[PDB]
Amino acid sequence: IGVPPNSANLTEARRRVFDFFRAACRSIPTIMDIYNLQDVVAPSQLRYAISAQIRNNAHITDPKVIDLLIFKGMEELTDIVDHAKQRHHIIGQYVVGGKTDFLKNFYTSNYF
Amino acid sequence: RNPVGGARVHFSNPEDAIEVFVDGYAVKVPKGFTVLQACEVAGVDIPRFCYHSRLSIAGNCRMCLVEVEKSPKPVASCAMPALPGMKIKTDTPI
Amino acid sequence: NIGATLVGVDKFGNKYYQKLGDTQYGRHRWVEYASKDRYNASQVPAEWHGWLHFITDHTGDELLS
Amino acid sequence: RSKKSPMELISEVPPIKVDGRIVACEGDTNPALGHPIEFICLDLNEPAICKYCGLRYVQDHH
Amino acid sequence: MDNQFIFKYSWETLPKKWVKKMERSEHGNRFDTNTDYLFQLLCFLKLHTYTRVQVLIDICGVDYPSRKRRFEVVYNLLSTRYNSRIRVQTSADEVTRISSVVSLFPSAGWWEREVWDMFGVSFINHPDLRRILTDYGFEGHPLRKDFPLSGYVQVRYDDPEKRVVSEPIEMTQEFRYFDFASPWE
Amino acid sequence: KRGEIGKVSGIPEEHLSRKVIIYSPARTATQSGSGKLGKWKINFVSTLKWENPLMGWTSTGDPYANVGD
Amino acid sequence: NFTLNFGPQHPAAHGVLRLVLEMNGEVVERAEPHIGLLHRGTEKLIEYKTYLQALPYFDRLDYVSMMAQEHAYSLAVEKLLNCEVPLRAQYIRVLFCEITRILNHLLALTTHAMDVGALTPFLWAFEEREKLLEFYERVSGARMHASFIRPGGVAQDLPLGLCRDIDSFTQQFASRIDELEEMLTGNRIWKQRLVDIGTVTAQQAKDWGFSGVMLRGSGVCWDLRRAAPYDVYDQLDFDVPVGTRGDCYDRYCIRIEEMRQSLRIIVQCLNQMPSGMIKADDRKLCPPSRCRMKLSMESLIHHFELYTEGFSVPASSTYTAVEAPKGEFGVFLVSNGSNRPYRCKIRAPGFAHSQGLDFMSKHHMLADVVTIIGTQDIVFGEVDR
Amino acid sequence: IRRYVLTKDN
Amino acid sequence: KDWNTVFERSINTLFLTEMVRGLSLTLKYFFDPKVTINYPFEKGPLSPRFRGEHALRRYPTGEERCIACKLCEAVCPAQAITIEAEEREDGSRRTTRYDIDMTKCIYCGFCQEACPVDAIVEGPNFEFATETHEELLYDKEKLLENGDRWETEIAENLRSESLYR
Amino acid sequence: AKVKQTTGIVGLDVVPNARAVLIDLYSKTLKEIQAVPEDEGYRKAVESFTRQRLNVCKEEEDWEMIEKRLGCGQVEELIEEARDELTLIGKMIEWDPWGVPDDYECEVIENDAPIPKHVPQHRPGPLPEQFYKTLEGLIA
């Protein structure tokens, strides 16, 4: 329902992170039916995708920033649950994925 | 307040520094500064057409005219030297 | 085109008619195009365009001079 | 005569004879329908060109 | 009834710890309060007999990137009984949640959603705080000063993909910014 | 750099690694007024522009083409 | 209960309407309007334009009532500038605002009647709509988006025959309203499709931010032209109609009466309009005459500066609201002292009205939702900027 | 502008 | 209430007497003159202030009035004008490129009222729908052709509002 | 003398007895404002206007006379104000905002920039006398 009050410590932020992760995990079966993802992706590759996003945003130590990140993730999850976003959008974002980098960039363009 | 354009006033000595009232505000300027420069120190930017800070003073355009209490006629602030205790007036009807 | 007065003729052959109105107007300034091959929907010169759209009261023969 | 550019068209208008040393060019017979008023000094030998119209004015006698 | 009367009455009646800035002028009588006293102030101004403010006209945000508390939230209020208008303002940055007033004024929901969509300010105890105006999946808050005018992404139809797709923006003619500011201002 | 606001803002990660210049623009040489001074600006160094090969217009693909100005 | 979708893409009902209805049986339990299909970023585009350049944006906000938004923007700019407007310009602005109110009321009433199923009054009303758009096309150069009302005075003067033609129009608009009223008011089907539909109490209208006909249908006598008068509205005589039951029928009756009173105000403005100049004499804020710019140096300098930089509004912020045909149209203008607005929020009456569709339609038939939508006179140009 | 600042004033 | 009133209002309920009153109005409007116009042949009334297709005017001597002041480009709220200028061979200030985006134009007339030499005007033409997008990217040649084609009507209109502008 | 047929406002219904409901609400308001500290601006204003309205409701029996003397809306718009004031008093009691901070400071900006006459300005008529009497009570 209502937006939760702002957290006061990192423990509450971690608890909200875990709650949101569990909510996203329970939301996995619904997406597999709303979008024809049955013969597309394993039911654990998506789980790993959310885990990887949480882990690469895991260097934050500000509880307010963590709460805002959780809120944005929950908004994205609610949007994906509804038919608002197109099918290829989630498949375009939620899929897990030789001389020198400098020389290839040099061959490409002057603006690195 | 700060000088117009962030201008830096170099005081050679603290002894030689007169005091003027640009708009009722106490302003400390070195001896030798003009009324226009004293106004520039006090954040007031006087109109000018013929005055350039890198060129010699020549009060032709008469655009920088201000009011001075001990003056019957407006003075060209670009050429008038600043005197201690002088009260300048810029936004007055004159 | 019945009970109407021909105002003038255009260089393309278009004929311009006028009828007098009293209180509600209607069919008082129109053109009989000299062509019938779909008439291109835009063949009125600048001197007659103003008269047709009631912009100016000059016919267009007078607008030339 | 679409082959003539406006430069060539304005280069064919003969200069206007003016008796005085100065002429005011407005650009049209009706002042409100022309360009801003332009005062041209005719103290040279070559015709003096209006910077709006391109019209050239030359002094008549001296 | 008037700016001269409302100012004095609210100076006397209101608790002092709520309001920290009071302007009385012809442009509008404003009140500036901390974000933790906003709800209390509006509840007081909605129920008091001599300050019966029962209409919330709108809620808007203002972006000031040079301030520490970046965003300014403005509550324009109207009192039909006394024919007077009151403006109440608070200040919040990008990572603080201010109290919602949907409990007092039911119409506040859509303006609060619009403020969150346009500036990124979150409201505590809002029944549903989701974007209302921007496109689905929109990233970024457009009404911020640091948000580019044309945005970051562009929309076009992809024939091989057989759907309307989103691509990074690439203008055929960039926005020409004209600097008309005068040095004699 | 604690770019947490950049992460919770919505700017794409590609544009969050830009190099900017913070500077105060100086007075123009063609005017003696000093009104447009004292303000500080962020220069994103957005120089990647080209010419439209249909009308000669200036095309760009940089969102921060004129934000700082 | 199941979930329903009305997206009418055809402009037989708005055009960008998107309702997600939760219906138990034939009743609707909640109406969730999805807006944002016409959000064009108008508010952000204002900050990148000069005060003069941002004026045409307000024509396209409530595109059935064009002069109402320009009047509000001009009044806000004058308030932030302390610019005095000549009396003739004020009379012209009031006259055209009332013409705009009549146009909006006609379009609203007959587009609402067409949704119910009455096809005839639509074309009968659009005839008079064409007649009034002729008057707009005469003074300005545009039939609809006329940038006529401007912050200083008004853009330009009236042609010769405009007053005579407007008087001729007013000689018959009363009979036009009478015929339109005869088609709908006494009809039993029209009564049965509006009576007791969309009832709102005064407390609900105040809480949800209702204004204009929506608010005055509940018994609240609140008119911004009488509570906070602007221009010469305090020198004109007109009544304020007030409803008794708050249903859709009272809204329709009040919408008829408001248009009759607008006719009355138009007649008074025509009779009492004085002579004089149409703009403020401070040429630092208004353009010079085309004959003066081509003859005087200072007039040319003013023309150049106005049409490149424009005027600079001193640093301040204010909220000005006018009585738009839909309701209270407000502009929250913030100025930082430059030639471009720092912030300009547009308070659209349709926003607060479409927000309240959820509670007006609850426990109503599906066929009554179209009437509830049409009685609010919602256009989405203003709902989502 | 008369931007005077109030105080508890004991 | 009265038996007479009950009888009177019960008859009107059953005899549909408030629908015959609408049928009579519709029928009376059936036998009436129509107000529709034959668009290809007769056009609707306009005004000399009408803002239609843009046109670049020239002096009666054959010189274009545009002096490349870019004052119309700076006032355009839609940024629909792009102007490139340089010193001509004679030394006159003239445009090399003057193109207007008719897909960005909002037809507000700000450019017409900002031109100090009356070079850019909006003519009475409103029938210029094209079959291709880049035919709506008017350039200097197209605008000059419009000015030459509509010169007499544009001149008459500008003469008309000489008393107002 | 007769009962009010209609209030003219949708949702607001005529109360058959308004001198018996207003008197009780005002008595409750006076008995419940006691918990607020004596030297607070809210208590003085609330205990002033409530006292006058209670008295006025006491002297005169008919509702028409009560409407005339108070001159501020109908009695059905006064019952709702009394109930809202009771609710506000309760919320003040539970919030307890009466504590003046030691570091309190307020910037009272006084701008005097004039605005034009044609600009929309909210101009009400003079308020009833108690709206001022409470004001001098607060100042004193």
Ligand SMILES: CCCCCCCCCCCC(=O)SCCNC(=O)CCNC(=O)[C@H](O)C(C)(C)COP(=O)(O)O
């Ligand atoms: C299809 C589904 C749609 C929605 C999918 C989700 C989309 C958004 C994903 C969320 C994006 C975010 O950044 S939301 C989550 C961001 N919040 C954090 O990262 C908190 C900081 N991390 C830590 O404290 C620890 O590393 C911790 C990781 C907790 C564990 O380690 P320990 O306990 O040992 O301490």
Ligand code: SF4
């Ligand atoms: S009419 Fe308006 S939008 Fe079109 S080119 Fe002229 S100024 Fe620009």
Ligand code: SF4
């Ligand atoms: S058309 Fe007029 S305003 Fe535009 S550049 Fe040419 S002379 Fe200047």
Ligand code: FES
């Ligand atoms: S600047 Fe010209 S007189 Fe001083």
Ligand SMILES: [Zn+2]
């Ligand atoms: Zn000339």
